[PDB]
Design an enzyme around this catalytic site. Structure first.
Site, PDB file in Angstrom:
ATOM      1  N   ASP C  94      -7.747 -31.109  33.076  1.00 13.29           N
ATOM      2  CA  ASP C  94      -6.880 -30.308  33.933  1.00 13.29           C
ATOM      3  C   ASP C  94      -7.690 -29.410  34.859  1.00 13.29           C
ATOM      4  O   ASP C  94      -7.260 -29.127  35.983  1.00 13.29           O
ATOM      5  CB  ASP C  94      -5.904 -29.478  33.103  1.00 13.29           C
ATOM      6  CG  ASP C  94      -4.870 -28.776  33.965  1.00 13.29           C
ATOM      7  OD1 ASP C  94      -4.302 -29.448  34.852  1.00 13.29           O
ATOM      8  OD2 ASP C  94      -4.619 -27.568  33.767  1.00 13.29           O
ATOM      9  N   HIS C  95      -8.864 -28.948  34.415  1.00 10.68           N
ATOM     10  CA  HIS C  95      -9.717 -28.179  35.315  1.00 10.68           C
ATOM     11  C   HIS C  95     -10.323 -29.067  36.393  1.00 10.68           C
ATOM     12  O   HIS C  95     -10.662 -28.582  37.478  1.00 10.68           O
ATOM     13  CB  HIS C  95     -10.813 -27.464  34.525  1.00 10.68           C
ATOM     14  CG  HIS C  95     -10.381 -26.154  33.941  1.00 10.68           C
ATOM     15  ND1 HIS C  95      -9.178 -25.561  34.255  1.00 10.68           N
ATOM     16  CD2 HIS C  95     -10.989 -25.325  33.059  1.00 10.68           C
ATOM     17  CE1 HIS C  95      -9.065 -24.422  33.595  1.00 10.68           C
ATOM     18  NE2 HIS C  95     -10.150 -24.256  32.862  1.00 10.68           N
ATOM     19  N   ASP C  96     -10.472 -30.365  36.114  1.00 16.84           N
ATOM     20  CA  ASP C  96     -10.934 -31.291  37.142  1.00 16.84           C
ATOM     21  C   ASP C  96      -9.823 -31.573  38.149  1.00 16.84           C
ATOM     22  O   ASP C  96     -10.062 -31.570  39.363  1.00 16.84           O
ATOM     23  CB  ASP C  96     -11.440 -32.571  36.458  1.00 16.84           C
ATOM     24  CG  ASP C  96     -11.725 -33.736  37.418  1.00 16.84           C
ATOM     25  OD1 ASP C  96     -12.384 -34.691  36.953  1.00 16.84           O
ATOM     26  OD2 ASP C  96     -11.340 -33.728  38.605  1.00 16.84           O
TER      27      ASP C  96
END
Ligand code: HEM
Ligand code: HEM
Ligand SMILES: CC(=O)N[C@@H]1[C@@H](O)[C@H](O)[C@@H](CO)O[C@H]1O
Ligand SMILES: CC(=O)N[C@@H]1[C@@H](O)[C@H](O)[C@@H](CO)O[C@H]1O
Ligand SMILES: CC(=O)N[C@@H]1[C@@H](O)[C@H](O)[C@@H](CO)O[C@H]1O
Ligand SMILES: CC(=O)N[C@@H]1[C@@H](O)[C@H](O)[C@@H](CO)O[C@H]1O
Ligand SMILES: [Ca+2]
Ligand SMILES: [Cl-]
Lengths: 104, 466, 104, 466
Positions: C94-96
């Site tokens: 999700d951070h990507d």
């Protein structure tokens, strides 16, 4: 807008109770397919000379109009099933539907 | 920066370049005026460019009552207390009615005939003075609304003017809706298109999107493919006018004086009733008259409509022809032979291929118009697929549709389901002979003409409140 | 965009030949359904006191968090089929994928 | 205007509210900080407010290399031909590499321990040093990239630094793509869900839209329901390690010093591979720890996670639960009994109906989470559909997909199909115990741990250039 209403409104608000602003004029169009521009966001094709579209040179609109659209005027063929009411009502409907502004 | 007298390519200007060896213009230094559309977000380098709209997308007679509160207030008549529209004072058309005048800073109406000294008209839109026929249609609609309001007031004495005004507006909107659908729709696309794209109305839906599409606009420009180069008139007994029986085009644009000082509107309607249209073909597309001397008088040089259409299509940014063929679910040609077989003409395929290089780059308008016509229709499959979906979406998203429960009654619907496009000219003008069944199909004279007495009317007794 | 390339661009531009902007950074989101607001374009729900949504009042986020989400911690149950790697892999993914900027 | 020290409801400030009889905040006049998202069109009164993205949507390991030119220019090593990455210079953890430090005007890392003076970290995203296991993962990935680049340089001597850099980046990106897909996806959606939503790959397709939507952003957040309220550690031979074997999650936020001065990154991983997760039940929805003492040491009042999430969902302007039920082609309940039947429960539906007025106003997150899960899965019949649709849209649009023709050879495809995370862990550090097939499934000792001696290795002979 109130719970109970009977007649229409001039602007067109509260025509869709879930989203009251849908289509009530002064709104942008809807894109069925993503747009396409030479620069990516702001420049149309044919602006900067020497820039090809899809690996091919662009064609002038006037040349295309002169090539295929041209036809002699003394060879008109009438249509024996429709009248001018067709075209007039089409134009009236188009004037009813939408309009696009331009700067002065 | 004034593009009306300059040709420098600086924003927001975009002139048209002229190819060598043009039959009309020889010099290569000339330019064609053109303007760019208004962006939605000024000075933004984040979002993608978009345009604006300024009219209600629903079909509710928005061309007469306007689309803004100040315009509606200005157009209404507030002198007396009946509920009425505004009419002119300086002139009358045989003592029936006329449209009110308008005030403009720099009008193009006063230039075409200086000696006339006749200003422009005022209506719900700013493009009503292009041809006299549009003015005739608007005046007919206004007269019909006037008569309906007068009759409705004459029925009930207790009621006040505002109620009659709003009810007349509702009645007019319902009338135009049912007329345009039930008459115009089946005669353009065909029976198969009606079977596949427009089923029977079932119930109201609130999760559909009633907005108008960006592409749809250009598709309707197909209506520019059938225009006669002349204008005709004829008297009560059907023989041409004397003098000026056949007036050529390129001389009637922005001609407001013709309606006022040259008889009125009835001969124009009579000419409109009994004249055949033009038939599209793959070697005859656009009439020369509107392509070489368009708006000749008001500007320094005439323009051409197909070139402007192509320029607008390029400016908007719509994709190519093959993408739109894929969108509707149709085969995509690749080579010259496939395209020639699809269009059933190798000569036209070669003609298009020398200029456009590859089929992917063909504009939407040129590709759509060049398609072969359907049987009992007027457009190709692609334009049918484009138009039908949009009209179906527009139909199933109007809360005030005339067939929805709670808007009308059973007896009211039964009475209202009879209105036809004729019986309006008879009751609003001096015409006594009209068509028989469809105004859009019968054109042979006198094989399809009857008397005015053999036409039924409508009763408003149900609307009486007591 | 150049007619030939061999490696990914630093920002993802020119990944799609027909439309280069699609997929790049510093662009807007996409909408699958029309948006709903208090007045139509900008105002959110609950900003003006005494207003109703679809004919009913809107509860508070804190109250609904207190009433339902609350649960005693001594009655925990450990999943016997899944390890703790899920947290880290989901966090990475999700951070990507996305990040929404917020004014300071 | 400072919202962290004020309660005025003026833009861009959107404070929350508390009900009477709050267990924690007894004073009803207090506020919880909150800010609105940044709009796309700043000031327009025509368009509709929308948010913006900041990172590339394609899965290309953008969390390490970055997405902006200056950031990637300031992260490389320009002082040598080798073209490696930049590492720390003042601290070393007895290993081979560590993340570089960072300087900021406001550093929250300094306030965690006054006597440690350890600042925060720097990576491809601004939230690297917010949860320590994320930092360990980033360090491990950087070490893997450095080793791969060194070996690739050692294979061929005559290359240039840029070629080695790009080759290593491409290898890492393809490798993370394949591991993430083939491992993560089968254990969330389930067998039938993927058999119906994800068919086999066929070829590239340029007519699909690879963008992202707000609904996916607000619906991928189910993992917040799996929180474990403690952090554990072990030693070289599996056993709790003294001192401080178990630490509460409250006093670990923004505490990067525990990664530098103590431990040595390895025990965090060792605890990671050998601890079970938390199951989700209809009466055990979310752990109390994240709802009571979140970011306690960095602000004045601890915040609540679910309330923040629902406030964000309301602010972003998303539709109700019934609309999303209709969007996926599922039956839509209307009454309390229908809600009870569709929820496979009675008390929960009763509470939901009591706290609201109609099921149409149920928020997306609560409706998605509260639903019963599927068999051999961890999501309901709605979140699974949304996630699968988004992933399928994201897969079939990227041009540089590893299975696409023209990007890899037959030999490279044959030899690249056996890359696994346990080999990564056993090779990049001193870890010797791994699981066999799925690290996400095997979670016990000693029945599910073997030495990596019996494990294959990745070869780069085919990458040799000659
Ligand atoms: C260590 C585990 C996790 C957290 C700590 C945490 C907390 C947050 C917070 C405070 C936000 C809001 C601001 C921010 O972007 O940090 C947040 C948003 C998002 N999460 Fe969180 N969460 C933890 C755990 C997870 C897991 C397991 C996730 C997915 C499997 C997950 C996802 C997300 C996403 C996508 C966001 C959106 C970011 C945004 O700015 O909107 N998180 N999390
Ligand atoms: C539909 C339709 C439009 C779109 C209106 C709009 O986009 O504003 C349209 C446009 C034009 C234009 C382009 C410039 C502009 O309006 O901004 C011109 C110069 C023009 C003039 C003429 N119109 Fe037209 N046109 C549309 C459709 C139709 C139809 C459909 C059945 C008819 C008939 C028609 C008639 C004519 C016309 C005939 C000689 C000229 C000239 N138009 N319109
Ligand atoms: C604006 C306008 O012209 N209004 C006229 C009004 O002056 C006239 O008294 C009335 C008679 O029916 O018709 C209308
Ligand atoms: C050259 C020309 O158009 N002349 C006309 C004239 O025929 C007409 O009688 C008069 C009426 O105002 O307007 C002028
Ligand atoms: C900026 C930086 O960290 N550069 C390092 C350098 O200090 C180290 O000596 C070298 C060894 O290969 O690797 C690189
Ligand atoms: C309150 C606190 O965290 N104090 C720490 C202490 O635990 C640690 O031993 C020391 C090492 O320098 O740094 C300080
Ligand atoms: Ca990315
Ligand atoms: Cl959306």
């Amino acid at each position: 807008c109130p719970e109970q209403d009977k007649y229409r409104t001039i602007t067109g608000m509260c025509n869709n109770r879930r989203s009251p602003t849908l289509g009530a004029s002064n709104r942008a169009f809807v894109r069925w397919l993503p747009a396409e521009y030479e620069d990516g966001f702001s420049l149309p094709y044919g602006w900067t000379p020497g820039v090809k579209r899809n690996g091919f040179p662009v064609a002038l609109a006037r040349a295309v109009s002169n090539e295929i659209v041209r036809f002699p005027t003394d060879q008109l063929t009438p249509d024996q099933e429709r009248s001018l009411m067709f075209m007039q009502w089409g134009q009236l409907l188009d004037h009813d539907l939408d309009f696009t502004p331009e700067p002065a | 920066v004034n593009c009306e007298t300059s040709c420098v390519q600086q924003p927001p200007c975009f002139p048209l370049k002229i190819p060598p060896n043009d039959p009309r213009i020889k010099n290569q230094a000339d330019c064609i005026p053109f303007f760019r559309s208004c962006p939605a977000c000024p000075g933004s380098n984040i979002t993608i460019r978009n345009q604006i709209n300024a009219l209600t997308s629903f079909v509710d007679a928005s061309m007469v009552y306007g689309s803004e509160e100040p315009l509606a207030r200005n157009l209404r008549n507030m002198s007396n207390q009946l509920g009425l529209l505004a009419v002119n004072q300086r002139f009358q058309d045989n003592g029936r009615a006329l449209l009110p005048f308008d005030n403009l800073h720099d009008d193009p109406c006063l230039l075409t005939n200086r000696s006339a000294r006749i200003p422009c008209f005022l209506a719900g839109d700013t493009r009503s003075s292009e041809m006299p026929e549009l003015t005739s249609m608007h005046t007919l609609l206004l007269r019909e609304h006037n008569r309906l309001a007068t009759e409705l007031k004459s029925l009930n004495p207790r009621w006040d003017g505002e109620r009659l005004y709003q009810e007349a507006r509702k009645i007019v909107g319902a009338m135009v809706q049912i007329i345009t659908y039930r008459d115009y729709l089946p005669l353009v696309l065909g029976p198969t298109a009606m079977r596949k794209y427009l089923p029977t109305y079932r119930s109201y839906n609130d999760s559909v999107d009633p907005r108008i599409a960006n592409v749809f606009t250009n598709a309707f420009r197909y209506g520019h493919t059938l225009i006669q180069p002349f204008m005709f008139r004829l008297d009560n007994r059907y023989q041409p006018m004397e003098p000026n029986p056949r007036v050529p085009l390129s001389r009637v644009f922005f001609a407001s004086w013709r309606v006022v000082l040259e008889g009125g509107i009835d001969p124009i309607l009579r000419g409109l009733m009994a004249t055949p249209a033009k038939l599209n073909r793959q070697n005859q597309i656009a009439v020369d008259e509107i392509r070489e001397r368009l708006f000749e008088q008001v500007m320094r040089i005439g323009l051409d409509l197909p070139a402007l259409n192509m320029q607008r299509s390029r400016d908007h940014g719509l994709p190519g022809y093959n993408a739109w063929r894929r969108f509707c679910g149709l085969p995509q040609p690749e080579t010259v032979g496939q395209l020639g077989t699809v269009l059933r003409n190798l000569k036209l395929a070669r003609k298009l291929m020398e200029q456009y290089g590859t089929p992917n780059n063909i504009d939407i308008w040129m590709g759509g118009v060049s398609e072969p016509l359907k049987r009992k229709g007027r457009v190709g499959p692609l334009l049918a697929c484009i138009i039908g979906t949009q009209f179906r979406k527009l139909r199933d998203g109007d809360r005030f549709w005339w067939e929805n429960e709670g808007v009308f009654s059973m007896q009211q619907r039964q009475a209202l389901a009879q209105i036809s496009l004729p019986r309006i000219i008879c009751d609003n003008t001096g015409i006594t002979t009209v068509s028989k069944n469809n105004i859009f199909m019968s054109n042979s004279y006198p094989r399809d003409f009857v008397n005015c007495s053999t036409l039924p009317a409508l009763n408003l007794a149900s609307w009486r409140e007591a």
